[model samples]
Target: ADQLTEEQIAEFKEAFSLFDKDGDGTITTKELGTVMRSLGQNPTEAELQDMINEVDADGNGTIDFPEFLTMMARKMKDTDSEEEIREAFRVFDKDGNGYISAAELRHVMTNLGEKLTDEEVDEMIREADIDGDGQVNYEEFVQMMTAK
Candidate 1:
């Protein structure tokens, strides 16, 4: 569960291909915008430029697959820590039963010190609750944070 799987690798490659629009086997700032948009996120021109600057290991204004892998893996490692993940699950599992209820999810963002709207909280809950059981458990929570 900690390491990215082969399917995940393929998914990343396809995403990288989508960004490497010129078919020159390298990804640039413009290419990054395409991937961000596909993921329902938008990067400003400056943000895109920054992303390229950070990921383009060669300083050539483009990222190759190896560079892409390095960036993605490093980012995943940086964001996912066992302690912090458990804290997020603890907040969601308001009843302390290792499972999170829909109503309990209403407080998740606020509990995380993120000032989000009710609608945003609902969206987050819906996104994380995979079993349709009106709740989220530790496993689901882990998946959400990793994939996110």
Candidate 2:
């Protein structure tokens, strides 16, 4: 979702880690008030809510790291796209061999802090694999170009 490099990302990573004081991997308005108050300032509840809404890139009412990162840099979230799914697909495409397998999916999910159930993994791999090839490859349609 974000195109960033070492120091740049680390800077924001540090910034986000501090911002998510509870360290639950997301930032909400309550945390905003906590941090603000700890620094001896007070914003109204409505004002805090409004501030977070402005930064809640996913509009999901809480800001995750990427959403926060985008806000600090790009300043907006995209509406949607196949390219969007690629960012998602890129996440699980850990090995970057272009398709994802069951082992890779498990590896990635756990690596990314997801505690997916075995059934959950099965469901995800199943739908993404479409042909049930035991791996997932996105957005490809073959046999269309046998041209001379």
* The best candidate in terms of TM-score: 1
lDDT of model 1 at position 88: 57
Instruction: Specify the poorest-scoring 10-residue window by lDDT in model 1.
Output: 70-79
Query: Per-residue CA lDDT of candidate 2, range 1-148, in tens?
Result: 3355678678667756777848787776456565445445555788666667777646665677775555444322233334555566676676776666756766676667647787876776666565786776643311111111
Against the true structure, whose lDDT is highest?
Answer: 1
Candidate 1 TM-score over all chains jointly:
0.42
For all predicted structures, in order, the TM-scores are: 0.42, 0.34
- Model 1: which residue pairs collide? none
lDDT of 1 by residue, 32-93 (tens): 66765654655578755665677764676666766666645544555566656777578556
lDDT (Cα, 0-100) at 70 in candidate 1 = 60
Error of 2 at 115 (Å): 2.2
